[PDB]
Structure formats: structure tokens, C-alpha cells
From a paper:
Bacterial DNA gyrase and DNA topoisomerase IV (topo IV), both type II topoisomerases, responsible for the ATP-driven introduction of negative supercoils into DNA and ATP-driven supercoil relaxation and decatenation, respectively, are validated antibacterial targets. Gyrase is a heterotetramer of GyrA and GyrB subunits (A2B2), while topo IV is a heterotetramer of ParC and ParE subunits (C2E2). We have developed compounds with a promising activity against Acinetobacter baumannii and Pseudomonas aeruginosa, which are both on the WHO priority list of antibiotic-resistant bacteria. Cocrystal structures of 1 in complex with Escherichia coli GyrB24 and (S)-27 in complex with A. baumannii GyrB23 and P. aeruginosa GyrB24 revealed their binding to the ATP-binding pocket of the GyrB subunit.
The pyrrolamide moiety is bound in the lipophilic pocket and interacts with Val43, Val73, Met97, Val122, and Val169. Important interactions are hydrogen bonds formed with Asp87 in A. baumannii (Asp73 in E. coli, Asp75 in P. aeruginosa), the conserved water molecule, Asn60 in A. baumannii (Asn46 in E. coli, Asn48 in P. aeruginosa), Gly 95 in A. baumannii (Gly81 in E. coli, Asp83 in P. aeruginosa), and Arg150 in A. baumannii (Arg136 in E. coli, Asp138 in P. aeruginosa) as well as cation−π stacking with Arg90 in A. baumannii (Arg76 in E. coli, Arg78 in P. aeruginosa). While retaining excellent in vitro activity against A. baumannii, compound 27 also displayed improved activity against P. aeruginosa, possibly due to a 10-fold stronger inhibition of topo IV and more balanced inhibition of both DNA gyrase and topo IV. Whereas for 1 there was no killing of P. aeruginosa up to 8-fold MIC, compound 27 was bacteriostatic with an MIC of 2 μg/mL. Whereas in 1 MICs against P. aeruginosa increased significantly, up to 32 μg/mL, as bacterial cell concentration increased, compound 27 did not show any MIC dependence on the inoculum size in P. aeruginosa.
Residue numbers in the entry: 17 to 100, 121 to 219
The structure:
């Protein structure tokens, strides 16, 4: 059902031309990290605007489970990222890299337009826990792929205001501007 999203993206994400939907791609990934905060697992969220106009969102939560899911026969993480949520962002990204830190292991999966390049795979060790999503918006969906500091800042000011416990770091690599927002 990522096909449905790719076919009619306006209906899932918002306007693909005026910047509204492009920024909502970020809002949606961040909202998943806020869920992890609200559940009590996440105190810190990092959002980075890369020089190539891609986005990294990183949290210090539990990390999405990696265990094979009985029904699909793939990792729970893959299910979450591919089956209609964040799976919309995946569908509308030409490239998305998921990195999970969980039970002292680093796991990654790369998708193209939501299709996994490979099954979730072990790549390192870690003493941290949490979830990192890097995505590159598809230029077949979006025109004028240019993120706005002001738009993401406003959203984070909202999230920070409404969730006084969470520390949210915005970094713009294009300008080097950073700000930690925490009420
Ligand atoms: C950037 C970012 N961070 C997260 C994120 O941390 N989410 C986590 N979800 C869980 C969790 O529920 C899974 C099985 C689930 C998620 C959504 C819908 C249905 C099911 C279970 C557990 C657990 O049992 O330990 C941990 C996590 S962490 C997402 Cl999603 C995104 Cl995007």
C-alpha cells in the first residue's frame, strides 16, 4: 500500500510543491519520537538539516524492535516502515536509512521509495538505545526541495512548549545554526 501513497502523495502528506508537505515529512518522523518521549523512554530528540537538503531525526528511546514479526517474516522495524504513519515518509523518500540502537547492537535498513534494499542488518555495537531516520525526499514527488529553519524551528518551539520534559536539538548544517529547545 506504499504504491497508493506514491500514486496520490498530496492526499497523505500535503501539497508537494509549496513546501507544506516537504516539512510535514519531518513533522511526522518527529511525532514518532515524541510518542517515545510521552511513553517515558525518550528525553532527547535531534533534528538535522543536511547540506544536501536531507533530514536526520534521532531519539534516545527504546529503539524500534528488530525481532522477526511472525506474520510478515521480516523485522518489526521493516513492518513499521513499510506497512500502512512514518511509512508515508518512507514511501515519499527516494532514500531512507533507518539505524536502531537496541540491546547493545546497531541495526540498519535502507529503503528506496519505501522498498527495502536489504533486510534489517547488524552493523556495529553500542551502549546507547534509540532510533535514527535519515531521509532524502523523492524529487519525483516534491518540487523545490528546500527545508526552512523557520518552519522546523516553529514546530519544535510548539513541541517543546507542549512537552516541557523533552530536549529537542535543531541543527542546520547549511548555516551551522543550532538551538536546543527545552521549556
Ligand atoms: C524516529 C522514530 N522513533 C520511533 C520509535 O522509537 N518508536 C518505537 N516504537 C516502539 C515499539 O512499538 C512498535 C512495535 C510500534 C511502533 C509504531 C506502531 C506500532 C508499533 C515498541 C518498543 C518496545 O517494545 O521496546 C520500542 C519502540 S521504539 C519511530 Cl517509529 C520513529 Cl520513526
Amino acid at each position: 500500500g506504499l504504491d497508493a501513497v506514491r500514486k496520490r502523495p498530496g492526499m497523505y502528506i500535503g501539497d508537494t510543491d509549496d513546501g507544506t508537505g516537504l516539512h510535514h515529512m519531518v513533522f511526522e518522523v518527529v511525532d514518532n519520537s515524541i510518542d517515545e518521549a510521552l511513553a517515558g523512554y525518550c528525553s532527547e530528540i535531534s533534528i538535522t538539516i543536511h547540506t544536501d537538503e536531507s533530514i536526520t531525526v534521532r531519539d534516545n528511546g527504546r529503539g524500534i524492535p528488530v525481532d522477526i514479526h511472525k506474520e510478515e517474516g521480516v523485522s518489526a522495524a521493516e513492518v513499521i516502515m513499510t506497512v500502512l504513519g512514518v511509512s508515508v515518509v518512507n514511501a515519499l523518500s527516494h532514500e531512507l536509512r533507518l539505524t536502531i540502537r537496541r540491546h547493545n547492537k546497531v541495526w540498519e535498513q535502507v529503503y528506496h521509495h519505501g522498498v527495502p534494499q536489504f533486510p534489517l542488518r547488524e552493523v556495529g555495537e553500542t551502549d546507547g538505545s534509540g532510533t535514527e531516520v535519515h531521509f532524502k525526499p523523492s524529487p519525483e514527488t516534491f518540487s523545490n526541495i528546500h527545508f526552512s529553519w523557520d518552519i522546523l524551528a516553529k514546530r519544535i518551539r510548539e513541541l517543546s512548549f507542549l512537552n516541557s520534559g523533552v530536549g529537542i536539538l535543531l541543527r542546520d548544517e547549511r548555516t551551522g545554526k543550532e538551538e536546543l529547545f527545552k521549556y
